[PDB]
Amino acid sequence: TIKVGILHSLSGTMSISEVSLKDAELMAIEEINNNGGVLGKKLEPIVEDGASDWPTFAEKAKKLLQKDKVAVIFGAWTSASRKAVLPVVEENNGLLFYPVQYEGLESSPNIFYMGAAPNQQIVPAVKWLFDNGKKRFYLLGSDYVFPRTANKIIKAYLKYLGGVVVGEEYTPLGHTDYSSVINKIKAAKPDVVFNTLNGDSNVAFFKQLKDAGIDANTLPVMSVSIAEEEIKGIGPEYLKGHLVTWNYFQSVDTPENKEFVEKYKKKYGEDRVTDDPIEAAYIGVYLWAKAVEKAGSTDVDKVREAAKGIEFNAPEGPVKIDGDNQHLYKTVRIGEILENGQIRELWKTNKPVKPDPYLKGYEWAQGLSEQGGSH
């Protein structure tokens, strides 16, 4: 067999988000094994709990690479967990397939990024909001590197467009008391809240937000780290009318997505939903396996070379590994949450967008990463 690692938060504040990623990866593995496996071998998943603990993510990655001798690790969600795994896969010349939207400003040669780069999510989210009258942003997120960097990007883009930030607050991951933040929002009276909270902190915020008398008609919240899965956990009654930006919705009308959702529901239950992180985790297993097949080997250097330019008929639409940076070409979509927790798409790119993690195509994003070179 060919052993593959699965490294996700199965416990802790992030487990609301990451458990269904392990499910999506195992489904793709089961599908590939039933079709004859890879290089004549079956895939054997080694599942490890990251426990929403970034030191634990690092030690588990070291064990999977050095002890279990996996060929690849599928996992991580928070950029804190990814950046904890980054030195491990780089030092061991391992591979991490990372399925979660994030802040960009990174391009490890040992990470394949299946989630949105900022030009494929956060940046067009701001532009669409601005173009639709939202000028005064209130920034709320969790206190770690992704929301801090995301809000750094958002402020620079808002300065370019002509908008302002009238509030900025951070809470530790797993925080549950949002009355103080909500009271500040009530006083500031912003046009929109841009929400970068991650994990089950979102359960507490959106419940306390509605209980405080605020609904989506009075103050829309645009979220980038929750989707259909978390919406079902929080409760669609607390999210109806609020906004998300992703590359994929369960409601996407493609033949590929129709098959994907039925298969996911057939395996895990008719009540189960799919969303963008779930799609990216499923995509990531298929793309890695396709690179191994093309390379004729699980050797990381050979897999890295073969993965350049590989395409996939993904549920969201056509995707492709960008050889420049090991990110994915993805379609951008913005939608509003429906009463049943599904997304009604309001806007999208007419084609997949090339990933641009360092925002090289955005003239206003010059000194954001502070890193030298051509990136």
CB of 114 to a second copy, least distance (A): 20
Amino acid at 160: Y
Residue 318: contacted member of Br ion, a second copy, none (CB under 5 to 8 Å, by partner type): none
Which range of residues in 11-19, 71-79, 233-241, 248-256 is near Br ion by CB under 5 A? 11-19
* 371/332 Cα distance (integer angstroms): 27
* 193/356 Cα distance (integer angstroms): 25
Nearest to 331 by CA among 323, 320, 340, 342: 320
Cβ closest to a second copy, residue 10 vs residue 125:
10
Residue 232: contacted member of a second copy, Br ion, none (CB under 5 to 8 Å, by partner type): a second copy
CA 152 to chain centre: 18
Q: At what angle do helices 54-66 and 79-91 cross, to 10 degrees?
A: 30
Give me the residues paired with residue 48 across strands.
7
Residue identified by tokens 């809240």 is 193
Which residues between 12 and 41 bind Br ion (CB under 5 A)?
A: 19
Residue 133: contacted member of Br ion, a second copy, none (CB under 5 to 8 Å, by partner type): none
Q: For residue 13, what is the DSSP state?
A: T
Residue 45: contacted member of Br ion, a second copy, none (CB under 5 to 8 Å, by partner type): a second copy
Residue 370: contacted member of a second copy, Br ion, none (CB under 5 to 8 Å, by partner type): none
Residue identified by tokens 């590989």 is 310
Task: Give 268: exposed, middle or buried? Use CB within 10 Å, 0-12, 13-18, 19+.
Answer: middle
Residue 235: contacted member of Br ion, a second copy, none (CB under 5 to 8 Å, by partner type): a second copy
CB of 271 to a second copy, least distance (A): 5
* 374/172 Cα distance (integer angstroms): 34
By CB under 5 A, residue 166 contacts Br ion = no
CB of 278 to a second copy, least distance (A): 15
Could you please report the per-residue DSSP string of 240-289? Answer: TT-EEEES--TT---HHHHHHHHHHHHHH-TT----HHHHHHHHHHHHHH
CB of 355 to a second copy, least distance (A): 31
Residue 58: contacted member of Br ion, a second copy, none (CB under 5 to 8 Å, by partner type): none
Task: Give 325: exposed, middle or buried? Use CB within 10 Å, 0-12, 13-18, 19+.
Answer: buried
Which range of residues in 9-17, 30-38, 109-117, 261-269 is near Br ion by CB under 5 A? 9-17
Cβ closest to a second copy, residue 48 vs residue 103:
48
By CB under 5 A, residue 10 contacts Br ion = yes
Q: Which helix (H) or strand (E) holds 157?
A: helix 145-161
CB of 110 to a second copy, least distance (A): 24
Which range of residues in 6-14, 54-62, 132-140, 222-230 is near Br ion by CB under 5 A? 6-14
CB of 12 to a second copy, least distance (A): 9
The binding site for a second copy (CB under 8 A) comprises 6, 10-11, 19, 22, 26, 45, 47-49, 51, 232-235, 268-271
Residue 268: contacted member of Br ion, a second copy, none (CB under 5 to 8 Å, by partner type): a second copy
How many of the other CB atoms lie within 10 Å of CB of 186? 12
Cβ closest to Br ion, residue 47 vs residue 145:
47
Which residues are near Br ion by CB under 5 A? 10, 19
